[PDB]
Write a protein that binds this ligand. Sequence first.
Ligand SMILES: [Ca+2]
Ligand SMILES: [Ca+2]
Ligand SMILES: [Ca+2]
Ligand SMILES: [Ca+2]
Ligand SMILES: [Mn+2]
Ligand SMILES: [Mn+2]
Lengths: 90, 90
Amino acid sequence: MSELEKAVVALIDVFHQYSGREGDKHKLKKSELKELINNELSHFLEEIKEQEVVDKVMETLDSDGDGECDFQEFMAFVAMITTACHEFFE
Amino acid sequence: MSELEKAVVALIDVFHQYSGREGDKHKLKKSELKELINNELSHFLEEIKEQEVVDKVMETLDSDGDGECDFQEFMAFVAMITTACHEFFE
Ligand SMILES: [Ca+2]
Ligand SMILES: [Ca+2]
Ligand SMILES: [Ca+2]
Ligand SMILES: [Ca+2]
Ligand SMILES: [Mn+2]
Ligand SMILES: [Mn+2]
């Protein structure tokens, strides 16, 4: 297993750690997405403390509009973060 | 550094290992993309042995059409693989 293959597994791994906590086990609701950000992206993103920020963040990632973040939408979220972190180093 | 953050760094890491070998250091040409697939995706994708397959694969990922794979296009490639590997487990 290479570093790239390890990265792919970790992306599937972390999405399921958080999506299966409540409700639809294949989608991140607000409370699961917030904990994912707060617990797994603590060096890339600011801690989410306000309801208005979790609302805003889900509104951005929720492109098909059911109020939750599915796997496709999560992959888009990861590309955004990854592209942001890539550019940081200029 | 969490597992998700480690995944993000590895994606940026591996893209630069291969893109900076030749020519444009920010884009994967055919020969770099082939080696990336063959050396880092050996459990997810078949080894590329034929010129016709490397041509086909670059044609699929090269959405803006300059014959190379840039970082955005690479992120789309990774989402594809990741979504394919996610569904495999049904
Ligand atoms: Ca859920
Ligand atoms: Ca959604
Ligand atoms: Ca290159
Ligand atoms: Ca291109
Ligand atoms: Mn799943
Ligand atoms: Mn770069």
